[PDB]
Design a protein around this ligand. Sequence first.
Ligand SMILES: Nc1ncnc2c1ncn2[C@@H]1O[C@H](COP(=O)(O)O)[C@@H](O)[C@H]1O
Ligand SMILES: Nc1ncnc2c1ncn2[C@@H]1O[C@H](COP(=O)(O)O)[C@@H](O)[C@H]1O
Lengths: 593, 590, 102
Amino acid sequence: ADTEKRINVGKKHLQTLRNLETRCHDSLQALVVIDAGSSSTRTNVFLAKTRSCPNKGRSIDPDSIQLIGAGKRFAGLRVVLEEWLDTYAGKDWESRPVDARLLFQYVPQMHEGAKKLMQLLEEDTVAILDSQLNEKQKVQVKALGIPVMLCSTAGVRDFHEWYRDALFVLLRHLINNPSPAHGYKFFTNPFWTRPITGAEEGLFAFITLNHLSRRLGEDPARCMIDEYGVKQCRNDLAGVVEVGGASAQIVFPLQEGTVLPSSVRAVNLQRERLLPERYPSADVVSVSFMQLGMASSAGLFLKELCSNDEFLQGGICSNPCLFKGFQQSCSAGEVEVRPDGSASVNEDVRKNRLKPLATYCSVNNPEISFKVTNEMQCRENSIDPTKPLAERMKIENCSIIKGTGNFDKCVSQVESILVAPKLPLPANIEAASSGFESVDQVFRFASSTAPMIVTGGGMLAAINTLKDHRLLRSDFSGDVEELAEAAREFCSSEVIIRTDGPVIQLPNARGEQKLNSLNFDLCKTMALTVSLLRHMAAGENQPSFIKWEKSIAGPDGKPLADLGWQVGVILHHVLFTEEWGRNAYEAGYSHNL
Amino acid sequence: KRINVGKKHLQTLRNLETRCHDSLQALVVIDAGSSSTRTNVFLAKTRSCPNKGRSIDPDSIQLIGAGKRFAGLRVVLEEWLDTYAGKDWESRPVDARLLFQYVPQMHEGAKKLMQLLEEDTVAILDSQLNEKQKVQVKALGIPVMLCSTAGVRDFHEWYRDALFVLLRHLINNPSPAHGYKFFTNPFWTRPITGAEEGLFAFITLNHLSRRLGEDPARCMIDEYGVKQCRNDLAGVVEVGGASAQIVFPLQEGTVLPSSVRAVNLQRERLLPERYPSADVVSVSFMQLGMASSAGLFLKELCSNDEFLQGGICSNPCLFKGFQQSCSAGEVEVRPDGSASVNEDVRKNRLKPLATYCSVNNPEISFKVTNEMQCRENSIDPTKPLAERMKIENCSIIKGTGNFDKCVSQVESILVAPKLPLPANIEAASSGFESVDQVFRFASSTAPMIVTGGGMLAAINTLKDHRLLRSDFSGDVEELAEAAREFCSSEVIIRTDGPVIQLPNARGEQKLNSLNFDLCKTMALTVSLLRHMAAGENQPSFIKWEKSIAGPDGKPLADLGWQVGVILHHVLFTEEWGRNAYEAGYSHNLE
Amino acid sequence: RPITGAEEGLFAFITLNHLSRRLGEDPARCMIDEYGVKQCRNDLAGVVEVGGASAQIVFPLQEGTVLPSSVRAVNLQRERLLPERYPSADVVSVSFMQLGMA
Ligand SMILES: Nc1ncnc2c1ncn2[C@@H]1O[C@H](COP(=O)(O)O)[C@@H](O)[C@H]1O
Ligand SMILES: Nc1ncnc2c1ncn2[C@@H]1O[C@H](COP(=O)(O)O)[C@@H](O)[C@H]1O
């Protein structure tokens, strides 16, 4: 009588079915972050595990977030508006005054320009999904809808009329109207698709760093009892130094028991709605330096160095940050190292590395008339706001720039021009910003023992180049003198012209590498790094360690996602359970019909 | 200037991304009653708002189609038991544990019924929706709420709960071919008690008639200056096949006897807190359903010396010329005029009362008086099932068509019994024992709506023969006069079948299985109205209704428990949004 | 204010459980339910209190049991006898006027 066996099969069958209707169900979801930078617009495709629980709705497991594809670098959002202003306002718009009111006639023409770009991003996104997902995964991803987060960093923020915000209204209309033939349910809203500031970018990069490295989590790393008797809990978070194209961000946890001066403030991630209340309280020093971006620092450096009598003689600017044998036209225009060995300087106003700073330093537009010191800071850098744009960016009494390959002079000038200028640029007081004005002020008044991660392609190139030539050891841990001695050797290299093109030839027959558009001025980045490390060493509190990272390894050893602001943007929406459930699932793609 | 066209274009696009968006949703209510299972298709307007999710506008709930009557859920279980337990399962002890060997066979029975219901639901959606409505309806998902009422309540083993697990599984796997995303969960698809049916019917009535809303009709200030607000709700009298429900608002400024309780809709999680407090008198009587009252009426009338003489039971609620064999078995009026009484234990009208009034049932074991209340109503729990339902010393039931004698027997057997059947005590009920007690001790001024197929057929029959005026508004003597005349009709056999021939040659109608015992319903109506009239407080008005017309005069939905079941879910905004939209049909992926 | 026999039983049950250190914010055991939600309870002791006018019997409802629909579990949080921070307490509460000493 194996009747008992077949009774239990029936009992277990019913239990299996009961468990299935009472337990949580997992489903895969795709998430898209469109990185709309200054000179490019690129799609970023993510996957996440959603959990659907009886009477609780649907949520994302934040630890499941993973990048499955980075797309093609298309034209920057700036290009859409520049071309629209070239056709309808006249190619003369960058110099001549334009009545913005008249441009409302060309709204569907602006819509068409943005449509071209959005179709290309949509095409590229669909391509990445189709190539990375199996048929089962595609069924889950197509049914759930695909939230889209388009965020413009730099480039677009520089227009100062109605165009910018109107463009955003148009991009969202295009995102919410995808072609039905592919079946991917792309959608957005004004909370997910919007421009972000340099300061907000830093906070997102801080969140990304801390999530990927698993330092950020609901469970506190350490708790402490305050003066009143209430338990105060925190995570052991790492700080971040992110050097981008248009700005550099420095975001790190506020030192425990530190009281900042009244004029500056710790940015509280819970108060700013970047982290939910269920996460340990996070108070950070947040700083975004507009003159410390790869592009903006290059422009300002030339403007200031080449207006200094020690460096400028008879129309020749002797640049200590450029290699011996290198020469270029005297301007902050975009440099192309030609196979010939020579340098081509793009003289277009649109391609000038000083353009963001020179538009910021004008009589016609901002803070210049407001605070006397603001106009005083522009004139100091030989950019008088009363002059037209071309004249403001022009390096006067200067014809050529010759490299002298003197690292110590390069460090001294980076210190004097970019890191500790006599008159800092106005302090930014937005919610995302602590309100600091210089690097010294940060490390003099608000230094911390939290570890620091150095990020940005240019920063990592500076270190890796020295390691590649065996000037820096692979175990390099951030010692200043070690870096300075390594860079002093590399930076004294000669530009040699060979049949295969120009080369950076190292002293004492150490070797060579090809000279190119990306590496010709990298000694300025090595000098910036030396200067940052010195200011960090001079702090009362020292970071427990300093590391240079491009990626953070995951549980399997493979990076789950890349460093930057993208992960942080997903998290600040996704971690707010109720609001995310309402927007992504209740409203969803069905909100578009 | 073409600039204003551009400025308007951006402002309209901006409004489009800041404003709420409306979208249509279909909702399904499967009514799994004792004799039948029928789908009910509804339409609703959803509103999607930035940072606020998606909700249903309750005023938009509209019935678009009520489908076919398929077999009762009870048939699934009876057939599976006849096969796997044996033909004598209703009368012999069964080892329920051995039946765990036949779970796929139970699933197989449920699957045939679910496929028929699914196909019918889809046919209704396809016949009522335009191509644009279909797009919206298909996108949002289709919540399904299967609720069983009578029929499955009395099995008392693991079977019913197991059947429900299988039904939700079937609902959660619809045919992908039609594009309709049907889905359910254990909160939507579940059995409901008779007292719960009453509360949902009371909610349906008050919602459709626009009495139930967030804004109160009247308030009273308490000792602490706090407003104690209420709506002006109507009560309901619902006579179904298996039970009769009475639900009405508790008379204002009153407190019930301490041994009974007012049912609070907000406390019972039926209405959200944003709705004024609704305290109700809630009553469900198994013995007052069409099928059960018919069985018990015969059981008690045919055991009384005044009616039973020489093996002949003289029934005053039956027509002169009508005759049937002595049993509470289902009556089939045959073409030849004769009555065919089904002797099957399964077809006995007394079977649900016999199941309640059994030693097996723990319900009669909790309370000591319960067994006595059963026995004194001629349903002896000590007797075996067949003996328990049998009418002794009786061969024939003869109709006498005496309406007043019928009313007086309805009073003594059904409305005001000397000793009622055990009172129903559950979270959804007040604990009253009889109709007489309801109106003697807890009468209200609230208007009353009389509903149910049989109740309305009884009023319509008298109106169609022009015995009652069309504008009849509930007068007891007008009703008793019309019913008295109709109930004195003679049953005549004709070549075309049996007819009810009205006196003074004032008409005729076909005699059938559905209308032969209709005079008992008329007597129940007179008896109920007499009790409501004698109350300290009388309803402001009394109406017989089947549906409530919308603001456009067009029919909005039907009266009954279905709309109320939808509301007790949709009105809890956050819970609804999570269940219908966040989890949705996508919860069934893989 | 006056209190009834049934309220007196609930009050006596709370007294006993507080004094014996059974009632408190710290649950004695927490059970992961069918949905995967941990449901915390104190290990409460029942009371038989025989007074002059009535006898009260109050004890926690058996874990995973379904009472007949004709009777109900008294929830202390719902009756505002215990705050929300205290683990949920469902009791069988009875007061018999005929079991008192007098
Ligand atoms: N290998 C590299 N050498 C020099 N500059 C780079 C390199 N990779 C990226 N950059 C620059 O560093 C900045 C940040 O780059 P990324 O971290 O790749 O977004 C931009 O101005 C890039 O053009
Ligand atoms: N036209 C009718 N004539 C007589 N009895 C009816 C009629 N319609 C329904 N009934 C009875 O009323 C009960 C409830 O019907 P309903 O409201 O349609 O569920 C049924 O179970 C039948 O016993």
